[PDB]
Design a protein around this nucleic acid. Structure first.
Lengths: 115, 115
DNA sequence: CTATGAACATAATGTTCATAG
DNA sequence: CTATGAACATTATGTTCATAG
């Protein structure tokens, strides 16, 4: 790694953690929320990148899955997430904060040097 | 393309254009100047990415090569660059300015929503 | 039809290797 | 040697395919 901008998977993983802190949404739901938030800026993530993020967090041991099966009128069989190790999540958030700041700097320097 | 952050090749191509506007440096020279400018932020591009940028610009028809042989105490078979179509270069700079602003926005939004 | 998640493709990169002269 | 640039490997990311409902 030459140390360029932050990767999308990491950027999304950051958002998966924050959303596990504030809500209980499943994959396609996270994807829908995310697309809506970024529709204006132009970023349109797909479902496989969101799943990759969520699953990477499972492997990192930060999240744990909760299989849910809501029965009745509108059958849903989704997967919800919660923290398995919030401390490791906090640490991931801090690392990502450093990655995001460098990134902001890299873009500022470029805006400054070419325009 | 899901429209995430700006790619490195584009980011470097932007810098090749600006540097063709302000100086006459050859590949390894551009690379040395670039590494020095970004040593602090932590970005360390390599010589093959710089060549890819320069060559992409040749294909886009924005630059043209000038083979230079620096004779004397230390012969050098170097390549210098100049504009072949500065108008197309200006347009590439503008497109990239839009890409860079979106990028800055994407990172700001992320810093704002998770911290 | 939804939702999950795998598979596979392609693109972006990063590391090595080739070569003129 | 040494500045350019081609090859090759590996990542990161976008599209399809497979299952279960």
């Amino acid at each position: 790694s030459t140390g360029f901008l932050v990767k999308q998977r990491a950027f999304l993983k950051l958002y998966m953690i924050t959303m596990t802190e504030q809500e209980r949404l499943y994959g396609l739901k996270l994807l829908e929320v995310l697309r809506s938030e970024f529709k204006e800026i132009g970023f349109k993530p797909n479902h496989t990148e969101v799943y990759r993020s969520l699953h990477e967090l499972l492997d990192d041991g930060i999240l744990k899955q909760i299989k849910v099966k809501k029965e009745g009128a509108k059958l849903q069989e989704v997967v919800l997430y919660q923290f398995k190790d919030y401390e490791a999540a906090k640490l991931y958030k801090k690392q990502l904060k450093v990655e995001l700041d460098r990134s902001k700097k890299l873009i500022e320097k470029a805006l400054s040097d070419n325009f």
